[PDB]
Amino acid sequence: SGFRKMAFPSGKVEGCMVQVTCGTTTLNGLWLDDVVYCPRHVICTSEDMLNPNYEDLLIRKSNHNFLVQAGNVQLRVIGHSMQNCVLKLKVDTANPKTPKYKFVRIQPGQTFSVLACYNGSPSGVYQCAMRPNFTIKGSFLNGSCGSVGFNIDYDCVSFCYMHHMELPTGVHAGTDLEGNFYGPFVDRQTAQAAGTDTTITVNVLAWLYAAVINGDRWFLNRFTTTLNDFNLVAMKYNYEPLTQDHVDILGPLSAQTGIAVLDMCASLKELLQNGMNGRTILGSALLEDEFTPFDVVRQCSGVT
Amino acid sequence: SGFRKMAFPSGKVEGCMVQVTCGTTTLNGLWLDDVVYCPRHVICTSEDMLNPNYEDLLIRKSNHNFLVQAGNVQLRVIGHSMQNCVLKLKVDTANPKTPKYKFVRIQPGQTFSVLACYNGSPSGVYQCAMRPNFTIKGSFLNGSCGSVGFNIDYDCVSFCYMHHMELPTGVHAGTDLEGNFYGPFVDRQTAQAAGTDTTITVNVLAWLYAAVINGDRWFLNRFTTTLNDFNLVAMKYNYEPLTQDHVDILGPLSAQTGIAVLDMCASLKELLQNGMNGRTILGSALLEDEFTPFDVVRQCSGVT
Numbered sequence: 001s002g003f004r005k006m007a008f009p010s011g012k013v014e015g016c017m018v019q020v021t022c023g024t025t026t027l028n029g030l031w032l033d034d035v036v037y038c039p040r041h042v043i044c045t046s047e048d049m050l051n052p053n054y055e056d057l058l059i060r061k062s063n064h065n066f067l068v069q070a071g072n073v074q075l076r077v078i079g080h081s082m083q084n085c086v087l088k089l090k091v092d093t094a095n096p097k098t099p100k101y102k103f104v105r106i107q108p109g110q111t112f113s114v115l116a117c118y119n120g121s122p123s124g125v126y127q128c129a130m131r132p133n134f135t136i137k138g139s140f141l142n143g144s145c146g147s148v149g150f151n152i153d154y155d156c157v158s159f160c161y162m163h164h165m166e167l168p169t170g171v172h173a174g175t176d177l178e179g180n181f182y183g184p185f186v187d188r189q190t191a192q193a194a195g196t197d198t199t200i201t202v203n204v205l206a207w208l209y210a211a212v213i214n215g216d217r218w219f220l221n222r223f224t225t226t227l228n229d230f231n232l233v234a235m236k237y238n239y240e241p242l243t244q245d246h247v248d249i250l251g252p253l254s255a256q257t258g259i260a261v262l263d264m265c266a267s268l269k270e271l272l273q274n275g276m277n278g279r280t281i282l283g284s285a286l287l288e289d290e291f292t293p294f295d296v297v298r299q300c301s302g303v304t
Numbered sequence: 305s306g307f308r309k310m311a312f313p314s315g316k317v318e319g320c321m322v323q324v325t326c327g328t329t330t331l332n333g334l335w336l337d338d339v340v341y342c343p344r345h346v347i348c349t350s351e352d353m354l355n356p357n358y359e360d361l362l363i364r365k366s367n368h369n370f371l372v373q374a375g376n377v378q379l380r381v382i383g384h385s386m387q388n389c390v391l392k393l394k395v396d397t398a399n400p401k402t403p404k405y406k407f408v409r410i411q412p413g414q415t416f417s418v419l420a421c422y423n424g425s426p427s428g429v430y431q432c433a434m435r436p437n438f439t440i441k442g443s444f445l446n447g448s449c450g451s452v453g454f455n456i457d458y459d460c461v462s463f464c465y466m467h468h469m470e471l472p473t474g475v476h477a478g479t480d481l482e483g484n485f486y487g488p489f490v491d492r493q494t495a496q497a498a499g500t501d502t503t504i505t506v507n508v509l510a511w512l513y514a515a516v517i518n519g520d521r522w523f524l525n526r527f528t529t530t531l532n533d534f535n536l537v538a539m540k541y542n543y544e545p546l547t548q549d550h551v552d553i554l555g556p557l558s559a560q561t562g563i564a565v566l567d568m569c570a571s572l573k574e575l576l577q578n579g580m581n582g583r584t585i586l587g588s589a590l591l592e593d594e595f596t597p598f599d600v601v602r603q604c605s606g607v608t
């Protein structure tokens with residue numbers, strides 16, 4: 001027992017990290033097969049980032065201007081193309097450490113591990129959620145661009161995120177591996193509104209189930225609620241409205257604990273209306289929304 | 305910017321994980337060079353765990369009874385020895401993936417990453433602290449025994465922990481890589497008192513510094529305190545007494561922020577005496593003690 005903000009083992013992703021330099025800019029690239037994927041802003045200088053004309057900037061670049069280094073060895077670039085906000089650098093050598101992989105677009109409210117890198121070198125790994133507003137609250141300094149988000153199902157790594165930018169508000173924005181930004185963001189040094197964020201209700205409920213499985217039960221009560229009544233409370237507290245799909249995804253946890261989803265909702269309703277009264281749940285003093293129902297089951301059953 | 309509970313990249317440790325089976329018991333082993341390290345309770349059955357005579361149990365075991373498997377390949381065991389609470393299984397093949405490594409005994413209050421494993425396979429990675437009472441609050445189910453705790457300084461992995469047991473209270477206990485338990489624990493299925501725990505003061509202060517570096521400053525005040533006065537408050541709130549050594553270790557953070565250590569102590573004093581008033585610091589509603597001053601500097605400077 002015990003419940004932690006657990007990240008996937010980062011080994012398979014570490015073997016893919018490379019450094020990409022273009023002119024004065026260095027960031028991280030992901031080397032899968034004979035292609036290196038990196039943020040397209042690697043081609044920019046300080047003056048460009050205010051409103052870059054990426055097409056024009058890229059035209060002044062040739063294959064030999066993209067210096068790709070996998071630790072101590074240099075990769076030979078034989079092609080370059082821009083797809084949305086990513087550059088795809090064709091190299092003459094397929095990565096020997098390429099794991100089985102997929103590029104996937106995650107949905108808001110889903111979680112993933114981030115392998116934070118600098119100069120193509122891994123610094124650390126953490127688990128996070130894609131906020132309902134498409135931002136991520138990560139830990140990314142200058143040069144972390146190109147660090148990726150992923151999930152692992154047995155031997156297959158599904159890459160879902162590539163880091164690109166830190167908004168003036170300190171939150172993070174990036175793209176899928178086809179270079180499409182999550183959210184309304186643009187790779188420009190400009191103030192950009194991130195939408196109103198909400199708390200991921202299904203995840204808080206999954207975490208209340210994890211708490212019950214792992215011994216923390218003080219918040220369970222004699223009450224129940226309806227999806228309509230709960231959603232009135234969720235509206236007041238800036239929580240995502242709960243749907244039957246979310247209830248259905250919580251099914252396995254409801255079955256394991258024997259606590260009906262709407263009974264758990266009434267505990268959440270009371271916690272929202274009264275707070276924790278200076279108590280904790282799984283070592284937290286707030287309602288945690290970065291564990292999905294799948295994360296809770298995987299961690300509580302020890303899926304490797 | 306941004307501050308997360310970041311674990312070290314687990315790649316170098318993943319390449320060392322093996323499965324060890326002896327009779328009906330299977331757990332994880334760490335394969336470094338031509339030796340596999342695992343908890344000695346792998347030799348026990350259900351009936352034995354109440355009060356095992358490990359020396360007697362081990363005498364009935366031969367090299368061929370220890371089945372060691374590194375994924376799909378089987379390792380040939382040519383020797384076995386018990387050192388404290390670990391078994392050292394000499395194998396005929398040195399691990400090709402052995403990183404540069406050290407075995408170290410960490411001090412209480414220090415942090416490390418745990419690569420949680422089942423059947424010699426990695427399931428996830430998380431960062432945790434060795435509590436002042438020598439326990440760890442991990443996430444470990446049955447079969448996670450043999451999963452290890454470590455730190456990484458550039459290319460060297462310092463292994464500091466091997467998981468052995470979950471106490472009746474749900475907290476975790478284990479050993480250094482020489483098999484010495486951290487704390488008064490014994491590898492027996494018996495109720496065992498863990499000492500009175502305290503909050504790691506130097507770590508909370510390091511985390512208040514991380515909060516200031518990363519934008520959260522609401523808790524800073526116009527006050528200062530002394531080590532004597534602060535320690536009177538720390539005594540009342542079950543916090544470790546602050547010493548000049550802790551102040552000295554906070555030096556770099558005090559220098560970067562320009563906030564004197566005793567000024568930060570007065571902010572901590574006010575937070576202890578008044579609580580957070582329903583506010584958060586770095587996404588937390590409690591005072592976090594699982595980041596050391598070294599962790600804060602490493603994460604805030606992007607050491608790879």
Ligand SMILES: Cc1n[nH]cc1NC(=O)Cc1cccc(Cl)c1
Nearest residue numbers: 140141142164165166187188189
């Ligand atoms: C400070 C930081 N953290 N994570 C990423 C950064 N760096 C940036 O955001 C640099 C940058 C500026 C403007 C637009 C874009 Cl796409 C990129």
Ligand SMILES: Cc1n[nH]cc1NC(=O)Cc1cccc(Cl)c1
Nearest residue numbers: 444445446468469470491492493
């Ligand atoms: C449930 C669990 N979590 N992490 C480890 C376990 N398993 C155990 O504690 C099994 C066990 C029982 C008694 C003594 C010892 Cl050394 C080991």
